[PDB]
Amino acid sequence: ASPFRLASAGEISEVQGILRTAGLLGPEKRIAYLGVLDPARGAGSEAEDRRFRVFIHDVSGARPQEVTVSVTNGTVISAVELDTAATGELPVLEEEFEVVEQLLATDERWLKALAARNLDVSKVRVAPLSAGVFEYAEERGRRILRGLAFVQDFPEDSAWAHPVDGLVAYVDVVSKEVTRVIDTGVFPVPAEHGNYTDPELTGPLRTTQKPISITQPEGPSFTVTGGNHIEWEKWSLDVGFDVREGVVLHNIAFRDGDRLRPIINRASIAEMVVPYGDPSPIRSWQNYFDTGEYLVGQYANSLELGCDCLGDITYLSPVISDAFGNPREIRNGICMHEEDWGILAKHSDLWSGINYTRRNRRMVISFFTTIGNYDYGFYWYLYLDGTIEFEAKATGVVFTSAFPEGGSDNISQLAPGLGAPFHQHIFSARLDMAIDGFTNRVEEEDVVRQTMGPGNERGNAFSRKRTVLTRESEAVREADARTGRTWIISNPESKNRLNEPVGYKLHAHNQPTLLADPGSSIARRAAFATKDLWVTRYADDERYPTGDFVNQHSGGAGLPSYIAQDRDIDGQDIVVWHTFGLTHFPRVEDWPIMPVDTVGFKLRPEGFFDRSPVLDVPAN
Amino acid sequence: ASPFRLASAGEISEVQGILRTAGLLGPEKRIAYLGVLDPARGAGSEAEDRRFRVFIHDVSGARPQEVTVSVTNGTVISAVELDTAATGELPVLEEEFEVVEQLLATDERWLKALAARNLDVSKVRVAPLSAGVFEYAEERGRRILRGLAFVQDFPEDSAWAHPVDGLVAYVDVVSKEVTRVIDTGVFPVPAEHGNYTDPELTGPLRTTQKPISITQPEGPSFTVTGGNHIEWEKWSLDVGFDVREGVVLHNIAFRDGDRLRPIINRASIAEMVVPYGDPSPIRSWQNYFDTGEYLVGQYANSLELGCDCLGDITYLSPVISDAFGNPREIRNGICMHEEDWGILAKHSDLWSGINYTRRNRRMVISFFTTIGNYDYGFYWYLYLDGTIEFEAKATGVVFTSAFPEGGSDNISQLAPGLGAPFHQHIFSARLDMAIDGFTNRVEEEDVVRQTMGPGNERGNAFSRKRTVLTRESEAVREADARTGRTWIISNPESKNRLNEPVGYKLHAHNQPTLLADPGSSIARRAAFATKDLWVTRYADDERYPTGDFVNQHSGGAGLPSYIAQDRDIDGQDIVVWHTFGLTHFPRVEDWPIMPVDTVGFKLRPEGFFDRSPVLDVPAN
């Protein structure tokens, strides 16, 4: 009954049937994106309408289409032909991954380049990388992928250990032409293998690790109803799944006594980008938007009990569409479990004699995705005390190159002859806020230092300053760790028992934002990543910080275009967009497979409750 | 046999006997500090000499003494009379906590102040707060505590809910005189109680939390030998305990193949300070150094299985001295256990077909201390991948005041009429480094942005810069989160297989440092807290960033005096001092008992190993 329920296989099968009968899904068509649309604002109408948005690619060169379907009514709502030179190309298709390698294998320029290096073409893997927009006029309106080559010595070999530097090719995957092959010179292919399961490299496995057993004898403390509605320790929320964004959290609310109090209407990681900092022409174009160009949800892993998720695990198995509109289940794609989280509160009082200890715990919702060499875990955490936290875990295999004789200012050495170019991993969290309802505002809070003098005779005082962001044009904000800068989302019409507006405070990690020159192509296409915080007025069609069609878009779409409307955000339905990321100078310890590194953010209540919300937690 | 073993009760009993027979421990003497001295550098002599340092207070007004004893030889090594107006007073004694309240209860000025407020003197608790150094010439060379009052309505009442604002007294605890009583006016005493175990305040306890069972069926993976020597997953270290510093880690090393490689010679939290930012004369003097003035180790809690420490716990029970030289055991004062820590590394490869997942875990060493209203957990973590992390957990009850009519720029409101002054919690970690041996250096590493232009035509390149700190005068450093600033401790004489110096990188949280005006008393006494990182040359007697005698010291002792020697630190035996802290604007959710908040730092290997050190972890 819930309009926020996960898409079913039957819904996707109906979408396929509707598209087919409307003439929109012939043999030359491919579904590049399919997802359920959220209910519109003010859906207190009980009139459920399950609508799906579809991007349709044409492999024969015809114009792609954007289509909205109503599965409830069995109709096509709208269908629009896209001009991709104007509005961007469609996301990369999984079936194009192999096309780049296959097309190059018959190109005489590519073959001549491999022959000079004595590389057997049957052993050469080609990574299908997104193209971006640079100086090549012939690429406008064409669907281009760029290929970098890696040698696999045998079928189980890790190709990443053997980059073929000095070589890149550009491919038009619709006309099936190799447009350019660039060979800047022969680099030795690094020879050491990177096979992290080879006993010769691992040595004998440790026998010292004794088991840790985590069980829940009475079962877990949370309940799941309607497929995807979670209630846990006064929290309630809906867990969604979208093929572009991955796990999406809807309707996050906290039961405070008799009242269900909303906090966040929708939370998602709405974009991520990995820009490379190597000026070599072989890689200086390299920036991949895993979310916007590749769709991270479709590469979600099936998570294994005991290995990926440990304890009393409840799984969700989301259903997505394949390229032909058939439903495909991601078995055990989302893990949900609670975890002990140490001490919650503790005090031993010298005057009352009372000794008091309580333990904390958190609810975990997570999935893992794999796109090429990189693997990412996305973790959402709910804590007993009202804190909400997000954590990204980056692992997998670093992207490699040759390490040049005489060194590099932009590449780390990992092994003899083997390099790893500097890069960043930058995320955008889209938080459709609903602090006690939809009338919200954002304030920027800085520590204020005070000078010794009258009224501060001992020079000890310090204070804080709060600045309300009133219009979109002033709501593009930068971090300032030195002044302890945070941002408070409050509801000016909902007050706590002290007559102060209720609120939540966003705590950032204050990592560097996008390092590229502001005049670069990537600074224009990933403008969201140049600032730590953006606030917009809610609008149905403003979904992604980079716009709807990221692949080969020339720039400026998304957040820079939205905020130019300069809308009122002071006590309105607003959306917070937070940029956060890792800057990665790879270390030897990252090779041949990288130990997890993490980044994230959290929100903590700030006068949202009338006192500690965990006074009713029992003594365990 | 280990010179780093914990002090035994027999050792402390021998110290008492040695002091007594030397005439140093008559009825008027009290031991204010007692601790074992670390072995001197170059102790490859097998000549064990267990020596103890003792601070001896005299309650009759005679000069205190610093005494060094050899328990191995049964002799007094040295005994020096202290001039406390010059070098500072001794730490606060536990038995002085009650003296402040008892002396005020018979002072007519104090009684007149309580009478005007209709407060029964038998219900008034007085917090014994350290005095600092301000404008009062009569306090120089005298042992002063300052008292702030709180009402306890009944013996189990939380007094912190009922501050008596507008009133402060200063007390000479040796001559037993009340030197000043300052009454700036009547504030209503806040009336709501803060009894977090009262069912009227908690409501009915939740019945929704199901148990989480963490067990180790084969026992833990670590071993403890010689009382306090830990070996765990290639790590080895000695766990010390000192009554001032608390848990101290010695000889942290990692077994890399056949080699035991040192990393850190000694790690401790060597000072902590809580400065208050309220300019009211009632509290503008308030800054307590829990470590240096009160000695956090002597107030360590006994930790309860299942509540404080959960899982398969191994306890240490350190022995300390009471004020008369009797040994006193802190039963179950230190918890040690390993914890699952999620995914360690993961990759699913599109070309090799191999799916790989490993789980992480960490070793935890922790203790909890309580000093008045505040409670702190100190956590040291060792991870499989070579990371070392420290985490402080702050909880307990916030220090309170009245909330003034018409508001405050320096105090938060928690309840009707109840305020909580702004403050910071600042820690100093002292890391006696030993990266592959004692020849170390520190480099400061900043991200470098590059301009679009020749050699960077697409404007994507970025790099990094490393600056070696060569002398103490240039080794006082500030954080810069915007440039991703970190610090690398390396050994220039020990190289990895790529011929690069081995190293470890310190990652700070980049929280604000001391906010007080640089001309303030607290900026002079806690100068360490004004900068994020200091590096000194190792010296036996340079133990604390604030000096040996913090209580009522006029300023400048410790780190500012050490670095004026301007010693060579480039490839030498060096010590890193890292300042980190929390800035606390109290929220309603912190009342009546505060949920834990955390701060810390971590060190990660940076080309210390020749490849990932966790390739030999089994598949679980």
Ligand SMILES: O=CCc1ccccc1
């Ligand atoms: O993560 C997206 C870029 C990519 C895709 C496929 C293989 C290697 C790299």
Ligand SMILES: O=CCc1ccccc1
């Ligand atoms: O934490 C040291 C300051 C203090 C000591 C005793 C009671 C309250 C406060």
Ligand SMILES: [Cu+2]
């Ligand atoms: Cu990376």
Ligand SMILES: [Cu+2]
């Ligand atoms: Cu605090």
Ligand code: NA
């Ligand atoms: Na365009």
Ligand code: NA
């Ligand atoms: Na909103």
Ligand code: NA
């Ligand atoms: Na002095």
Ligand code: NA
């Ligand atoms: Na050292």
